[PDB]
RNA sequence: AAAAAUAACAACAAGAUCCAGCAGCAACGACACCGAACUAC
């Protein structure tokens, strides 16, 4: 709570490219246009709604 | 002293037992409540004063057909209340259950179908067991100590039957029946009265009609006094007199230090 | 409790967009969202397929859609 | 929170549709749905086997329902 | 849990050697000693504790009624 | 917890070299140092910590009887 | 979470170079900068947000206790 | 209104009944008579149960009126 | 009204039959019915306790009594 | 006057034969289908004809949505 | 109706005998009945109270009292 | 039945559609809005039309205060 | 009647913080905002309607005298 | 910090204590609730403002006869409830028990008969003991955390009295009395605060009328703080000021962590 | 049949046992193994052939201070290996333990200090018990079953002591000892030998030196054949003969169906 | 947000630091991890 929501808010307000590595091993590219408690939107080339449980890690493209 | 004696005697027809002298033997044999089962007669038949003993009350519940089943019960003093229902089609339709209540102690005359008559009887027995285990699991909430005078038609362990090597195939000793009877005396926490005081073999309570098994003592223990763990400590003694037998089963007499009361 | 999954799914349903669901296993399914719920999603194909939520990884619409 | 799962599963079970339950690990189970719960389901392809919900991925009915 | 609890209890009381297929493919064998909301106990020379959230299926070696 | 904690605390008190098989097929060895509701600790040279959502099974080396 | 919180806090304060092994197999390296319900911010030159539901184990590398 | 014919029928046919009071306990027996506030239940002993304290009355066998 | 309640309560009172009353709470009081009206009953026990009708559930007599 | 809203609701529940609950004050979970309701009694029709008193009921939860006339 | 409740409570109030009122929940209040009325009874004790009739189950006079 | 407080309060809670919480004598807590009430019944709305009886209700607390006539 | 109405009117006018104990034994708090012949509105950050048929008793936190 | 104090002064007649200036000693001793035992006077006598300490309430229940018994109780604030009697003829008719409930706690004053006067006194003592242990067993499952700060006139262990071998036949240390007290304590899970805070010997409260007995310190510990095991964790300390010895008993004072409130 | 008779006895000094004639009576009684607790003699003293019986081997562990303690043990056949140790400081110093291994069965001559002498003895006993609980928690893993023929000097239940109300404070029956015994015989699962073969009372094994207690039958049960749950089923008979008294205690012969062998 | 129902608590001053040891596992779940999505163990 004290970390996830502020971190996602900072990632969104900065429009930084965010690489979301899923638990399956795929590297999804794009920016977090918005985020929810269960799904995160990663839009850059095509709309996407990556579910939270299927997200292993989320690395920014530059310092935040 | 505060002794309490209970006699469970399956008769396979009250007529034969009364002809052999079960009525007089019971009237002479001091006891508090006689859990006699397998009456095979309607309530109007038990009402006959010939069966009614002196100083002992009479209660009976029969199926739609008098010979289809039915179970009766005697008692020294008027119980607090008697109930002839369990809630199962395999119990009410056959009149296989009747319970009498004294001060925080309920005695029930349970009667499971033999099953040796055919495959349908075995299926009915399995259904009755699967429903009775659930009934017991539901009754674990109550605080009253229960004394089920059961004619389970099932041997628990090896000591409960002679020549088990040959009986492993005959009904009344298969794997599912054994598992159910162990679960009753296992997880559910209940404990048998007879096996508590006398942990010795050869104490059987049933023999086929053939006198060969009786001479060889090849018999099972189809009679149990299932006691709530609360009453497990009050088991004073148990006995299975075989000589004064009035049917295929033998009278099972259990005495406790508990003192019942109206 | 969520306020972004329900509207997104309702849009993908009413607009009838060819959706592609990629599960956590690493496979792909195609079809339109006929109905959604808190734990299941019906996908239209030769035979309607009920995909569980906990197994879905990504839901990509074949065309970009705008939020309400 | 099962306004869509419970009715579908109940219809598939009553109608006795040979469904195929694709799990998460990629295995393709089969058999008719005997009885479903909130966290487990029962199949009878050869024997009464219990499949856990959290391990199920999709349920493809062999016939359109 | 209207089916999980009675099913597991029936498999336990009868001591049916069950085969539990986990998620990663490997299967364990043995009878159910005891079970909880999140743990089952397998007795097969070593009383091991399997987790509910890791089991995929549970197949009894022999048919069982309900 | 009716059957989970009585087992983990027993293993802890008894110091049984338990083997934990995770959900991804990887095996770990060691004794339970201090189990919690979400994470368990191992008593190896590094004192690894394994979450209780990635553990598939926990098999002891010696048969442990529930008290 | 009686011991998880203090353990992670001790690993954070001391800036221990932990090694977080996920469930899929890949391992990440870096000191724990902060943690919260279903999230751990691993910061070591580059920042990353690893979800706890996807983490399998956390080897502290150095002998560190609560 | 229906209570009067219901109890009259349960008393005529002498059907074994099961009363369930507010506190939740069950009382098996056989109705002997009923009034505006009291019902005589006989089962070894004859006890007077109060209407306001009864919650349900289940006949042991199917009965209509 | 009470065409059957009084013939029974006054009968138990006259013969001084020891009866056990069962309150709505679930416990059980014991004793002989000393006096009773349309609202309350009195137990002849040593304490001379008074019980409220609306709080009573059943009145089990220690011995069967004939209905007048 | 005392059943302006209870009478039509119960009549609709009985006509539609919708699964009713009829919770008691004790908190028990009954069920069945209301066959006929009077001033102080409700005859639930389930596996066996049952009678439940009004003063012991605490809730009437129909399983399906119903509309009052 | 209510022909006996009036004199009993009246005497209990006049003699000021300490009575114990047992309610329906099983709770017990103790004190002197200061004033009895329809649908309500007034208690007297440290931090007096107003007990309702429909909630009372029994009134034990503690000490012997006659009507 | 002659009261001058329950009727206006319930009518205000109904017309304003305020989230209400009903605690029964048994101690069970229901939550929802009122559809229609009478001297013996109250129709609560919360995914179902729940007819809760009056005598089985102990307290009724709204999520926010309301004005009285 | 003779004792309920004046007592309740006094408790309301004086605004005594009373505690209403229900039939189940639960304890409530707040000042008597209003009363009626069937219900009572009790205020304490939220006006709750408590039914008279579910009130076991009312304990005034301050001694009160009848009129 | 959070601290509460309780005092126990068996005045053995409030008149004698007041004659020795005990009122001023109690007034100086800051306490939240004072439980003096054995008033030997009616409630009308205690109503005298002389015994009423400013800032402390006055409650008292007198026996059927003044000198026979009677108990009193003082509280710094108005207790939520005050009750007396237990249904037993040995308690109600003598007012030997007076309880006061505040919130989350209930402090009671108890006075058991000395039983040293005659045989009838010891018989009544046995009766009160058995009835009181029955009542307390009936009170174990309750929510109220009772503290029966009372005089039992019975020594529990040898640590409460020297030369116990000689006191074996003397009342207060008799085998049945010690057994009853040990059953009230351990079997039911109750404990004492004074021993809990310090398991030290040579600490007594009662002393015979002989002066040399007090000179050589020959006393018994009869006043106890029978305290439910729930609140035993909040006990701080306990003292036994043997300097005054104004009366046969001693001012057994105990301070706890819990704080009472209206 | 395979009747293994174990005879456990506390000689309270081998000198007194030899004087009263324990050797002859023990040799007369057919038994596979005999445990002698509290020898009060060094290993070299036991070397005398007077104590060496025909057909039996001589094993013994002597305390550091010979008079403080010491245990012995004879068996009919050369055991696999003798383990004269335990691990704790008290055991190693007072030689209060000696073990003999057999086929899947091992007999231990346990001896807990009586604690009847003084306070230091009671503290040593408490320490020995708090260590033996750990020891038994450790041995709970190995496969081989154990038979501790030990004089625990602690009565378990009321059936083991008459007039328990009086002995509620005598050493060997206080609350902590009772709790430790109940935990060792319940939580750990080490079922007793007497409470499983004969669930009757008056089975005392200890008697004070005062002849009054002997005549009145006032005695305590201190000897114990602690059995691993694996051996509980192998119990048959166990009776305590008091007429062949050779020390403060009395023998405790117990017959098992298990048969030992090298 | 509700135990398809406690034949019934002489009664809750009151819940919103090492196995005296298996006639022995065709072999340990193949060893503690070796960083743009493809539908039978």
Residue numbers in the entry:
A (entry chain C): 5 to 68
B (entry chain H), N (entry chain G), O (entry chain I): -2 to 259
C (entry chain D), I (entry chain R): 4 to 71
D (entry chain E): 4 to 68
E (entry chain F), G (entry chain x): 5 to 70
F (entry chain w), M (entry chain J): 5 to 71
H (entry chain P): 6 to 70
J (entry chain N), L (entry chain L): 3 to 71
From the paper:
The widely occurring bacterial RNA chaperone Hfq is a key factor in the post‐transcriptional control of hundreds of genes in Pseudomonas aeruginosa. Here, we describe cryo‐EM structures of higher order assemblies formed by Hfq and its partner protein Crc on control regions of different P. aeruginosa target mRNAs. Our results show that these assemblies have mRNA‐specific quaternary architectures resulting from the combination of multivalent protein–protein interfaces and recognition of patterns in the RNA sequence. The structural polymorphism of these ribonucleoprotein assemblies enables selective translational repression of many different target mRNAs.
From this core, another Hfq and Crc can bind to form a higher order intermediate (middle, 2:1:3 Hfq:amiE 105:Crc), and in a final step, a third Hfq engages the intermediate assembly, together with a fourth Crc molecule (right, 3:1:4 Hfq:amiE 105:Crc). The structure of the 3:1:4 Hfq:amiE 105:Crc complex was solved at 3.6 Å resolution. Schematic and cryo‐EM map of the amiE 105 translation repression complex where two Hfq hexamers (Hfq1 and 3) enclose four Crc molecules (Crc1–4) and a third Hfq hexamer (Hfq2). The amiE 105 fragment threads through the complex, engaged by all three Hfq hexamers and all four Crc molecules. The final complex fully masks the amiE 105 5′‐end and is proposed to inhibit translation initiation. amiE 105 is presented by three Hfq hexamers and adopts complete or partial ARN motif engagement on each distal side. For the Hfq–amiE 105–Crc assembly, the downstream amiE xARN motif in the proximal coding region only partially occupies the Hfq distal side yet still recruits 2 Crc molecules (Crc1 and 4; Hfq1 in Figs EV3A and 4A and B, left panels). In the Hfq–amiE 105–Crc assembly, the second amiE xARN motif in the amiE coding region is partially shared between the distal faces of Hfq1 and Hfq2, with nucleobases occupying alternating R‐site pockets on both distal sides (and EV3A). This sharing of amiE xARN in the amiE coding region between Hfq molecules drives higher order assembly formation and efficiently masks the ribosome‐binding site, rationalizing the observation that the downstream ARN cluster enhances translational repression of amiE in vivo. The proximal side of Hfq2 coordinates an amiE105 hairpin‐loop structure (hairpin1). Lys3 on the proximal helix of a Hfq 2 protomer is likely to form a polar contact with the RNA backbone in the duplex.
